[PDB]
Each structure stands twice: as C-alpha cells, then as structure tokens.
Amino acid sequence: MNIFEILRIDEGLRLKIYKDTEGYYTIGIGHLLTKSPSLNAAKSELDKAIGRNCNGVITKDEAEKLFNQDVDAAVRGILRNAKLKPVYDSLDAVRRCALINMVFQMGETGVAGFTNSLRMLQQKRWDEAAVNLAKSRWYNQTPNRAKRVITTFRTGTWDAYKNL
C-alpha cells in the first residue's frame, strides 16, 4: 500500500465542489480550495487551479493532477521543515506514510505543533506516542481517520487500511 492509496481511502474522491468536514470548499481528493464562505470565491480558486472555466466540476484526470501536486507538496513541506524532517528521516517506510497523511490533512504548521508526540515518535516509543496523539482536537473531530493513522504509527503495518 502506498501513500496515494491510503489517502484516496481517507479523503474520498469528489468531482464537484463540496464542503469538507470543517465546512470548507474542497474538490477532488481532499483538495482545499478556500476557507471562505463564498462559493464564488471557491469557483474562482477552482478555475485558477485547473486553468479552465470549470463551473464547479472537474474530471478524474484533473483530480489526479491536483492530487499528485498536493502529495508532492506535503513531502516537500516535511523536508523543509526543521521540526519535521528529523522525525521523518528517523522513521521506517510505513510510518513515514502516517506522517505524510497528517501533514496532508492538517498542514505542516498544524503537525509541527505536536511537539510531544513528535519527540516520542522520534524516540520510537510507539505506544506512548499513540496515546499522546489521541489527546488532540484532531482525534476528537475525525476519530476514525485519526485511529487509522495512529494504529499505523503504533504497529508499523498497514493493517488499519487492510480492512477498507
């Protein structure tokens, strides 16, 4: 299983503008368009992102294009972040997917803020980090998805997504 597949599972795929779990305008595979309340603002950002007049709808290919860009961006962001890079470099390949998934969801800034948990991952105290990570707004808001990432960090396997 790879990052693309895991994220495709956690975000879904929507070809029309929709509101994410926080009420923000999104399209494709978790591609945030805007945090503004205006649909026009969103359709505007949409057309700018795709390079065409979309009228709030895109194609599968266009979604996949945004998705590759976003994943790429997440990785790069991890690599350039002083708090994140060291954690990421210390981890195994599976666990690296878990960190990227959180960053894709919440931004580098948001993740860089889990100081305690990051330290614990770095030290490879899996159980402790899993408990610490659960004590967050992230977990309370999106519990099922959070459990999937968390078990991934805890077990170092893809079992949580093997059901799915």
Curated annotation (Swiss-Prot):
Induction: Expressed late in the viral replication.
Active site: 11, 20
Catalytic reaction list: Hydrolysis of (1->4)-beta-linkages between N-acetylmuramic acid and N-acetyl-D-glucosamine residues in a peptidoglycan and between N-acetyl-D-glucosamine residues in chitodextrins
Activity vs pH: Optimum pH is 7.3.
Keyword annotations of the record: Antimicrobial, Bacteriolytic enzyme, Cytolysis, Glycosidase, Host cell lysis by virus, Host cytoplasm, Hydrolase, Viral release from host cell
Residues annotated for substrate binding in this entry: 32, 104, 117, 132
EC number annotated for this UniProt entry: 3.2.1.17
Segment forming the signal sequence: none
Keyword Chloroplast: no
GO cellular component terms attached to this protein's record: host cell cytoplasm
Name of the protein in question: Endolysin
